[PDB]
Amino acid sequence: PRXDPRXDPRXD
C-alpha cells in the first residue's frame, strides 16, 4: 500500500 493508505491496508 502506497500513497496515503489508511484503515487496515495490507499488501503493497
CA atoms within 13 A on the CB side of 5: 8
CB–CB of 1/10 below 8 Å?
A: yes
Give the resolution to one decimal, in Å. Answer: 1.1
Task: Quote the cell numbers at residue 9.
Answer: 491496508
State the cell numbers at 3: 500513497
The DSSP 8-state label assigned to residue 2 in this structure reads -
User: What's the helix, strand, coil split of the chain in %, to 5?
Assistant: 0, 0, 100
